């Protein structure tokens, strides 16, 4: 399962602001091997950039531009890590 | 509209099996 022992961060997974990058981490060295599914849905677009890490922690970051919450479905081996669905209320940038 | 990316967790170095020998 893994989703039963995942520990994640989220400086920009609980709230973001257009023109500002947002990211999170899925620390789970315990679950060891076991990829993880992560995707977002909503009327907008963003630049995603992930990087595997022998630490099992999935480091990913993106910069959105159109305000609005983003349904982030985070599931391990297709399960549901603590609070899988994490919406992020996005706010305008500086314009 | 709909996009994401798949990951692949994995350990760093290998490990000596049990001292079966």
Q: Which of B3, B6, B10 sits opposite A37 (nearest CB)?
A: B6
Give the pairing type, strands A16-17 and A49-51.
Answer: unpaired
Pull the structure tokens for residue B6.
């798949």
CA–CA distance, A46 with A33 (Å, rounded to integer): 28
E strands present in A1-95: 7-9, 16-17, 21-27, 36-41, 49-51, 59-63, 71-76, 90-91
Residue B8, chain A, CB below 8 Å: the answer is: yes
Contact residues, chain A to chain B, C-beta under 8 Å: 2, 26, 28, 31-41, 43, 45, 48, 50, 52, 54, 56, 58, 60
The residues that bridge with A39 in the sheet, in sequence order, are: A73, B4
Pull the structure tokens for residue A11.
């400086």
CA–CA distance, A38 with A58 (Å, rounded to integer): 10
Query: Which structural domains are found in chain A, ordered by start?
Result: 16-91 (2.60.40.10)
Render the burial of B1-21: b for 16+ CB within 10 Å, e for the rest.
eeeeeebebeeeeeeeeeeee
Pull the structure tokens for residue B21.
């020998």
Contact A35 B12 (CB under 8 A): no
Residue B15, chain A, CB below 8 Å: the answer is: no
Residue A69's SS3 state is coil
Q: How wide is the angle at C-alpha A40 spanned by C-alphas A38 and A41, nearest 5°?
A: 145
Which residues of chain B does A45 touch, with a Cβ-Cβ cutoff of 8 Å? 3
> Are the C-beta atoms of residues A91 and A71 closer than 8 Å to each other?
no
Contact A48 B5 (CB under 8 A): yes
The residues that bridge with A40 in the sheet, in sequence order, are: A72, B3
**Sheet with A49-51: strands ordered across:** A7-9, A21-27, A59-63, A49-51
> Are the C-beta atoms of residues A43 and B14 closer than 8 Å to each other?
no
């Amino acid at each position: 399962g893994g989703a039963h022992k995942v520990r994640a961060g989220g400086p920009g997974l609980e709230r973001a602001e257009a023109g500002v990058p947002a990211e999170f981490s899925i620390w789970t060295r315990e679950a060891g091997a076991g990829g993880l599914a992560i995707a977002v849905e909503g009327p907008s677009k963003a630049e995603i950039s992930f990087e595997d890490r022998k630490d099992g922690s999935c480091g990913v970051a993106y910069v959105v531009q159109e305000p609005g919450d983003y349904e982030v479905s985070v599931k391990f081996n297709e399960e549901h890590i603590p609070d899988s669905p994490f919406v992020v209320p996005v706010a305008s940038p500086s314009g | 509209w709909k996009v994401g990316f798949f990951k692949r967790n994995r350990p760093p170095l290998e490990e000596d099996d049990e001292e079966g020998e």
